């Protein structure tokens, strides 16, 4: 019972809500335990990089599926 | 001791002093309308006599007078119905041609092009087609002329005036005392024999001397203006003997115990009349006479002013077993001192009775030319279904009200109520499990069929062609009823209804009644009905059982019966009161009744209603229910989409009104969502801004505008939701049946 690593108060919840709120507040970095401004900005910057990689992967997947099982040439 | 008439003289003065002082009945509404919430509170507690006074005598007097007022209102409504049928109808013309002329009893004025609603019903008359079945009722009663309808309307007005006078007299002049109301034995004895028994006997007498001869001549074929008047048959045994020979013997066979002589007009045939399509009036006469005798005999069981008779308290206290400890002790005190408990029992049985009435009326059409009137049949069935559902929900609500206000632990110790309240957890848990099991095994079957049909695997569906789910029990019962005549009912010439099986009863080229075959679709829809009824029962029962206390809130009884919550603590206590359970039960009841009426409509349009062309029966929808009702897509396309073309194409015709309401209802329903998904804080702040705007122009009202309370918001949302949904179904049903019926 300590999954919400970013929220010590939520980890003490002995009900199923702990899991629920443990997922709905994962991106609210400003409300996490021991969070500063520098760490907040750095985490957001890394998250931006991850999102960009996800977008690139999505586009690559679309292209690969069209070139593998599509009829683009026809 | 000793049942008697105890009354108090002039208890309340008759004047308009309190009419000019709104909120006089409530003590909390005395500080005046400081906020707009006072206006809503004035109407939300107008009939809550339990709060206006702590005396049971005054509450009983108020209830008695309110009953008289309601009776007067019903009499006014009946008078209006008869007057409209006598002055703005085509009943006389409809009598000469009841199979082609469509009944109509309403005429609209030409103001803004609305005269288009005056349809060409027939018989040189223009008006709105009615589906209340009043024409069939009047024909069964032998009205024949319009003067009789006018006389009945005037008599109904006189009765309404008498009812209102009775209420005023019993509340301001001669008010009965509490001991007079607590005479359950006398009340039951009079309501069983003096009311039901005497009324049934009187109706049987009227049917014998008025309905039988007039209807017999009408069926044989005689102009309505040529049939003798009712008094010519009621006071002339010669003519009535010409129609029924057993009458040449008078009343001698009745007193000599030779009742067989009366077998000509007191038959036990069965089935329906092949000419009119309804039940044999002789059979109805015999039925009313038998039930009248039974009720009169039953009205002599309870003890009153003599030694003979039984005691309700004695009978209740004597029914106790090893599994119920004390038994029914304390029930007599609860039912003789609490109006809410009696209201709950009466509402439950009353709604159940209404549902049973709807079933028995479509199965066995009791009026002539009623079965062939598809619009009237569908309308009557749906109307009674809705009335029954509403009454049942109200029964649950009042049961919870009694448990919250009139419950007393010192009087209910180790009895049925106490033992039930001591194991509510087991009851609720088991009901919850059965509801989940029913939901799965009922809806998941439809979902599985939808998935298989979409995947191109019709052989893996739950249909009559693939995995069959035949209702063997229902089919067995149906065949048993079909084989009842001559075996388990030797004196019966035919079955009670043609639905059990047999030939097809058609009148005027239209099928009045025919056997109703049950298949996999019927099995699925019946389990859906059982599941919905179980969920509604679970909600209502949970509210009644936990209205006093609960593990989450141990003092729920102190908060009352109608409260919004207990704050956001403990995770949230929103809608924890019994009133909220009733609020949710209303939605579930609406869902259940909606599915029931949809099933009835589709089944009758696909396997019953139709036309006979000497080569078979051409049903309205062609029997697509047996092949499409096993999937949700079939219900959406073959029933909702296919049958809605009649209401969406009614513009520019007489049914245009049905097309307008169909849309209007859709609006109201959606409107309800605003009150169901919102909260009071948002509206209060918005009102704050609007109030600032008003104050800026010196136009702010002293009666501070306030947002509707949480409970009021829920009530408004539920009322609008049900009004919109029911009105939508009403418009759709009426337009479809009036365009293809």
């Amino acid at each position: 019972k300590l999954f919400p690593k970013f929220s010590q108060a939520l980890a003490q919840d002995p009900t199923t809500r702990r899991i629920w709120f443990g997922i709905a507040t994962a991106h609210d970095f400003e409300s996490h335990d021991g969070m500063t401004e520098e760490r907040l900005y750095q985490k957001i910057f890394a998250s931006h990089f991850g999102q960009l990689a996800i977008i690139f992967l999505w586009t690559s997947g679309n292209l690969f599926h069209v070139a593998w099982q599509g009829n683009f040439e026809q | 001791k000793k049942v008697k008439i105890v009354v108090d003289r002039n208890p309340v003065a008759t004047n308009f002093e309190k009419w000019a002082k709104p909120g006089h009945f409530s003590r909390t509404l005395s500080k005046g309308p400081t906020t707009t919430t006072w206006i809503w509170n004035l109407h939300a507690d107008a009939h809550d006599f339990d709060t206006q006074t702590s005396d049971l005598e005054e509450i009983s007097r108020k209830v008695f007078s309110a009953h008289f007022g309601q009776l007067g209102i019903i009499f006014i409504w009946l008078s209006g119905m008869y007057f409209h049928g006598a002055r703005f109808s085509n009943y006389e013309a409809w009598l000469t041609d009841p199979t082609h002329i469509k009944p109509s009893a309403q005429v609209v004025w030409p103001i803004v092009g609305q005269e288009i609603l005056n349809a060409d019903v027939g018989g040189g008359f223009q008006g709105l087609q009615i589906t209340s079945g009043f024409f069939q009722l009047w024909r069964a009663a032998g009205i024949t002329s319009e003067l009789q309808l006018y006389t009945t309307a005037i008599g109904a007005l006189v009765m309404a005036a008498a009812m209102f006078f009775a209420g005023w007299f019993h509340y301001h002049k001669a008010a009965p005392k509490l001991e007079w109301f607590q005479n359950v034995e006398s009340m039951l004895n009079h309501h069983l024999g003096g009311l039901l028994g005497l009324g049934s006997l009187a109706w049987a007498g009227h049917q014998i001397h008025v309905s039988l001869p007039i209807n017999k001549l009408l069926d044989a074929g005689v102009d309505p203006k040529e049939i003798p008047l009712p008094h010519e048959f009621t006071l002339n045994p010669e003519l009535m003997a010409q129609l029924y020979p057993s009458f040449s013997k008078g009343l001698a066979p009745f007193f000599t115990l030779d009742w067989a002589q009366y077998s000509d007009f007191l038959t036990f045939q069965g089935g329906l009349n092949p000419v009119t399509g309804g039940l044999w009036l002789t059979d109805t006469v015999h039925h009313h006479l038998a039930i009248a005798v039974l009720f009169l005999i039953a009205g002599h069981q309870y003890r009153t002013n003599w030694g003979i008779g039984s005691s309700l308290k004695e009978i209740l206290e004597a029914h106790k077993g090893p599994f119920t400890g004390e038994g029914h002790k304390g029930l007599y005190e609860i039912l003789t001192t609490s109006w809410h408990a009696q209201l709950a029992i009466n509402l439950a049985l009353f709604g159940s009775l209404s549902i049973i009435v709807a079933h028995h009326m479509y199965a066995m059409p009791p009026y002539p030319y009623l079965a062939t009137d598809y619009g009237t049949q569908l309308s009557l069935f749906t109307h009674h279904m809705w009335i029954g559902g509403f009454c049942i929900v109200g029964a649950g609500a009042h049961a919870a009200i009694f448990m919250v206000r009139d419950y007393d632990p010192t009087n209910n110790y180790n009895n049925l109520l106490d033992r039930v309240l001591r194991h509510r957890d087991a009851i609720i848990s088991h009901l919850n499990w059965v509801c989940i099991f029913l939901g799965f095994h009922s809806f998941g079957l439809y979902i599985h069929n939808d998935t298989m049909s979409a995947l191109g695997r019709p052989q893996d569906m739950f249909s009559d062609t693939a995995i069959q789910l035949q209702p063997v029990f229902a089919q067995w019962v149906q065949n048993t009823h079909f084989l009842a005549p001559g075996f388990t009912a030797p004196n019966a010439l035919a079955s009670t209804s043609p639905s059990w099986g047999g030939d097809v009863v058609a009148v005027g080229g239209k099928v009045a009644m025919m056997p109703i075959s049950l298949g996999t679709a019927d099995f699925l829809v019946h389990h859906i009905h059982a599941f919905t009824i179980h969920v509604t029962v679970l909600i209502l029962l949970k509210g009644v059982l936990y209205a006093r206390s609960s593990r989450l809130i141990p003092d729920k009884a102190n908060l009352g019966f109608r409260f919004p919550c207990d704050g956001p603590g403990r995770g949230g206590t929103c809608q924890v009161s019994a009133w909220d359970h009733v609020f949710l039960g209303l939605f579930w009841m609406y869902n259940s009744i909606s599915i029931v009426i949809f099933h009835f409509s589709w089944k009758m349009q696909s396997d019953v209603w139709g036309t006979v062309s000497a080569n078979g029966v051409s049903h309205i929808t062609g029997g697509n229910f047996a092949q499409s009702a096993n999937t949700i897509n079939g219900w959406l396309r073959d029933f909702l989409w296919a049958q809605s073309s009649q209401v969406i194409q009614s513009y520019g015709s007489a049914l245009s009104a049905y097309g307008l309401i169909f849309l209007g209802a859709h609006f109201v329903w959606a409107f309800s969502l605003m009150f169901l998904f919102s909260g009071r804080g948002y509206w209060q702040e918005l009102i704050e801004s609007i109030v600032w705007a008003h104050n800026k122009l010196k136009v702010a009202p002293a009666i501070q505008p306030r947002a509707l309370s949480i409970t009021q918001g829920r009530a408004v949302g539920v009322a609008h939701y049900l009004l919109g949904g029911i009105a939508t179904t009403w418009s759709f049903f009426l337009a479809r049946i009036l365009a293809v019926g």
Binding site: - | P322, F323, G325, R419, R422, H423, D425, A426, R457, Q459, D460, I467
Partner: protein, 157 residues
């Protein structure tokens, strides 16, 4: 005068009641003789019995209702399906054991209805559940395998 409904073990302030469904002599005997209520039997053997019964009763449904029920090779396909279901409920048992038993705590004692002190069931332990889970796998797979053999044998069927 008899009262067949009494509070659980005479205590009327415990969320339970004794009824002819829970305290019935025959019902109590049958329920107590199940492999789950054997504090003195090894968890592995009880798990083997439970798995055997569950695996055997789990073939039938897919045999008579599976997508390939109208094919002669339905018995084999269903045997494999039951094996897969047993493996799934196997990982379920393992996950439950790994989550439930991961710590120790001075729990309260356990007594019988008469008041005789008894030790806690060894099944409610880290090693007890692991042994029970292992037996359930062997028994569950064996039950599914026996389900296929019964289809081939059994002269009536």
């Amino acid at each position: 005068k008899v009262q067949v409904v009494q509070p659980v073990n005479g205590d009327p302030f415990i969320g339970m009641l004794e009824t002819p469904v829970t305290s019935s002599p025959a019902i109590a005997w049958y329920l107590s003789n199940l492999p789950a209520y054997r504090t003195g039997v090894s968890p592995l053997l009880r798990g083997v019995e439970i798995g055997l019964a569950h695996g055997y009763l789990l073939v039938g449904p897919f045999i008579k209702l599976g997508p390939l029920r109208d094919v002669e090779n339905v018995a084999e396909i269903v045997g494999c399906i039951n094996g897969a279901a047993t493996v799934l409920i196997l990982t379920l048992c393992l996950a439950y054991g790994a989550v439930t038993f991961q710590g120790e705590g001075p729990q309260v004692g356990v007594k019988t209805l008469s008041g005789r002190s008894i030790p806690r069931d060894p099944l409610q332990s880290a090693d007890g559940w692991n042994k029970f889970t292992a037996g359930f796998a062997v028994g569950g797979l064996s039950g599914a395998a026996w389900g296929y053999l019964c289809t081939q044998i059994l002269p009536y069927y």
